[PDB]
C-alpha cells in the first residue's frame, strides 16, 4: 500500500551541521535555520504534512540518528546523512538529495599530499582523528586500518576542529560540502588536501517499507528537476568570508 | 523481504554502447550482449545468488517505454543508463543510484554554438533541435526550452540522432555525459560536445513499486559502490579513446 502525506504529522529528526542545520540560541529559545530547514518548508508546502522538527541531542552521531529513527524516535530524518550499505540494512532512504564525497582536512603547513600518505603510514594512526558513527569511520576501517579502531576518536565536528588546531591530531575526514564551507568561512587556518574519495549520496532516512515512500521520492525528484535543490545549495553554500 | 538466491529474474536491458553492446554474429544468426551492464549483472548475481534471464528490449524501445514495460510486468527489474525522474517514480521504484549523471549538447564539429543559450535565443530553429522521444532529454527540453511545446525534431533512437546530425538535418541534440564522451571519443570523431553540463541526475535500476526485494538489491549496490567495483567497471568500459 501507498498513501499521501497530506495532513500527516511527521517527527523530523535533524542534526547540527552548518549550513545544513544551524542552531542559534536567542532570547530564551533556540532557532533552527539552513538548507535543511528550507528544504523541509518546500516539501511541507508541496506535500501538506505538519512538520514536527526535532533536533538530535548534542554529540548524537550520524549512525545514532539513523538508529534512533529505526527505533521509532522519529518518522524521517533529514540532513547531510550518507547512504551506506550498513544503514540501508536497517532503514530506507529517499531518492538522493545530493551527491557527496569526502576530503582530507588538516592545518595549513602540515606536510600531507593526500590519501596515500595515510595508507602508507606517514601519519601515526592515533593522529588521524575520526568522528565515530560516521561514514568517514567506515571508510577508515575498510581502507586504512583493516578493521582496527586505532584512530583518535572524535565525538563531534567541534572536537575535530579543536583537535586539529591544538595539534592533537594531524588530519581528519569531512564531506566535501561542509569541508569547503568551514575552511572557507570559519577556520581560515585549516585547509583541504588530496583528491576527494568515497563518492556517495545524501538521502532522507525513512522507515523500511514506508507507506509514504513514493510521495516523498516524487517530490524530491521534482525539486531537483525544477532547480530548487541547486538554488538552495547556492543560497547556503556559495559564500567565503576567509581572506 | 528475504533472499533471491535461486530465484529467476527477468532483467530488461536496452542497447547503449558501452552499457549494453549488442553484436550479431553469423555461421544462422545469434546475438551476443556485453558491456558495463552485463558485468554489473554478473557481480550482483554472484553476491545475491539469483538466476539472470537477460532480455534485450526490442529495437527503438524508448527509455520511458522500457520503464512502462516493466510497470506492465514484462520484466522483474531493468538495468541500464536509465535516468531517475519524478514522472517515472510515479509508476516504478528505483534502486539506490548506480551512477551520477548529467547531460551535454551534442553537435557536429565546427558548429558555431557556445551552449544552451543558443537553443533558447532562436539561433537554432526548433525543428533543427533533435530530441529523442521518451527520454529525460525530452522532459528537459519541454521544461526549459519550449514551454511545453513539442516543436522539436523527434528522434526514435541514438542511431537516428547521429545520422540526422551527420546528414545536416538537425544541428544539436542532448546526450547523457558518460555515453556522450564515449561516442565522441570512440565512434563519431566529427561530432563533439559543447556548453555546460545540465540536468544533474542519477541512474538507477528500475524495480516494481513496493518491491519485496528492494532492500536486498539496495544493500548490494551500495556494497559494490563502497568496495570500488562500480568505479572499476566505469574505468573498464569508459576510459577508452580511439579518436585522434
Ligand atoms: Cl589523494
Ligand atoms: Cl563532514
Ligand atoms: Cl526497505
Ligand atoms: Cl551552456
Ligand atoms: Cl544518451
Ligand atoms: Cl563522425
Ligand atoms: Cl513505491
UniProtKB/TrEMBL annotation, chain A:
The answer to keyword Nucleotidyltransferase applying to this record is: no
Would the keyword NAD be found if you checked this record's keyword annotation? Answer: no
Chief subcellular location equals membrane
Indicate the segments forming the Ionotropic glutamate receptor C-terminal domain, all copies.
Answer: 9-239
Which keywords label this protein?
Answer: Glycoprotein, Ion channel, Ion transport, Ligand-gated ion channel, Membrane, Postsynaptic cell membrane, Receptor, Signal, Synapse, Transmembrane, Transmembrane helix, Transport
Q: List the cysteine pairs that form cystine.
A: 188-242
Q: Which residues form a coiled coil?
A: none
Chain sites annotated for binding L-glutamate: 80, 82, 87, 131, 135, 175
User: What subcellular locations does the record give?
Assistant: Membrane; Postsynaptic cell membrane
Task: Write down what this protein is called.
Answer: Glutamate receptor 1
According to its UniProt entry, this protein's organism is Adineta vaga
Parent-record interval covered: 457 to 812 of 895
